[PDB]
């Protein structure tokens, strides 16, 4: 929800074209009294309470909560035999049918999330294979999130990435409160 | 708009076994968009409703109303096509099965009253429908006799039960 922006708007009575004058005098006729022809009541009128402008639904959960989120998701994967650890995402060949038939042979399931440590140093063979496969997806470590992990039936990790994830998520507890944004230099952060 | 009545002449029944009563012939016909009031047309429709073709044509001949000549045309057209296409032996042995008038599509004009006031006048149109059944017309149901009244009254008393017991 945090990224979502709503694009829906509608015109109110004030924003609809025309509708200046009083359609007929109040007292005189038998008609029901009106002030403008563009009122909500009328056909062609403005909306009483409608979608109003671009709307943002941005908010921030606390950091420690998002961190804990990643932790739970990872435990849950390993608890349910949905998590796999690999030395490297290196493939004998770039033929994408090899990767599908391997998952079939290893009872991984219909959708597999492949995580590597860095985007640049991802193997050639896995990139070729995964590029033309819908259900199998390759992400760098920094990409990893709760939504993808839940969406995919399998989570596959490398040994480089497992040490990396441990470092960062375990860093979250056993740290102080900040004095200033962590992008700034500290005596021991990066 | 719906045009069901026209299509009723396209129904084909499968051939009968020799051990069967001879099915009466069956003709549906109409005229659409007659410039005449639907309720005014009803009286003329109602009049001819159960009579034989010729007897209806006779009654319609001397009738002074506008729609009377219109209905006469429809009936003659229906009679002609009955003989020609619907394989009816004699043109005389037809009777009006059902005679109906519907509301046709109407236009709206304005009527100018005094002061500035006005009203909405409607150019009234209507349809007429007819159905012809080959054979002699049905003899009308006889008026209820005293004996029939009596008979049914006896029946009615004999139907009584002791109520709200076992």
């Amino acid at each position: 929800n945090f990224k979502r922006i709503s694009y829906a708007k509608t015109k109110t009575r004030a924003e609809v074209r025309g509708g200046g004058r009083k359609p007929w005098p109040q007292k005189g006729t038998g008609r029901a009294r009106h002030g403008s022809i563009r009122s909500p009541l009328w056909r062609g009128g403005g909306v009483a309470h409608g979608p109003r402008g671009p709307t943002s639904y941005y908010y921030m959960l606390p950091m420690k909560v998002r961190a804990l989120g990643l932790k739970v998701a990872l435990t849950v994967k390993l608890a349910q035999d949905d998590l796999h650890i690999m030395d490297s995402l290196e493939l004998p060949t770039g033929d994408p049918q090899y990767l599908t038939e391997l998952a079939h042979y290893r009872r991984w399931g219909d959708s597999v999330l492949l995580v590597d440590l860095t985007h640049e140093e991802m193997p050639q063979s896995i990139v070729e294979a995964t590029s033309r496969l819908k259900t199998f997806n390759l992400i760098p470590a920094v990409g990893l999130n709760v939504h993808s992990m839940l969406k995919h039936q399998t989570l596959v990790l490398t040994l480089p990435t497992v040490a990396f994830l441990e470092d960062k998520l375990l860093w979250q507890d056993s740290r102080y409160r900040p004095l200033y944004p962590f992008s700034l230099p500290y005596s021991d952060f990066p | 708009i719906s045009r069901k009545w026209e299509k009723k002449n396209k129904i084909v029944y499968p051939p009968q076994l020799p051990g069967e009563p001879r099915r009466p012939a069956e003709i549906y016909h109409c005229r659409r968009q007659i410039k005449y009031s639907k309720d005014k047309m009803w009286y003329l429709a109602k009049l001819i409703r159960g009579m034989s073709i010729d007897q209806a044509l006779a009654q319609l001949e001397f009738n002074d109303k506008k729609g009377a000549k219109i209905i006469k045309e429809v009936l003659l057209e229906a009679q002609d096509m009955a003989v020609r296409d619907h394989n009816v032996e004699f043109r005389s042995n037809l009777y009006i099965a059902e005679s109906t008038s519907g509301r046709g599509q109407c236009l709206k004009r304005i009527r100018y009253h005094g002061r500035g006031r006005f009203g909405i006048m409607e150019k009234v149109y209507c349809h007429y429908f007819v159905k012809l059944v080959e054979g002699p017309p049905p003899p009308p149901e006889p008026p209820k006799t005293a004996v029939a009244h009596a008979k049914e009254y006896i029946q009615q008393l004999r139907s009584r039960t002791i109520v709200h017991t076992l």
């Binding site: 005098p25 | 599509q105 236009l107 709206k108 304005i110 500035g116």
Partner: peptide, 17 residues
């Protein structure tokens, strides 16, 4: 103490088939 009459627009009455 006078109320002027109002005419409906003419387009509705001039409709054809």
């Amino acid at each position: 103490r006078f109320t002027p009459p109002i005419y409906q627009p003419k387009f509705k009455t001039e409709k054809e088939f």
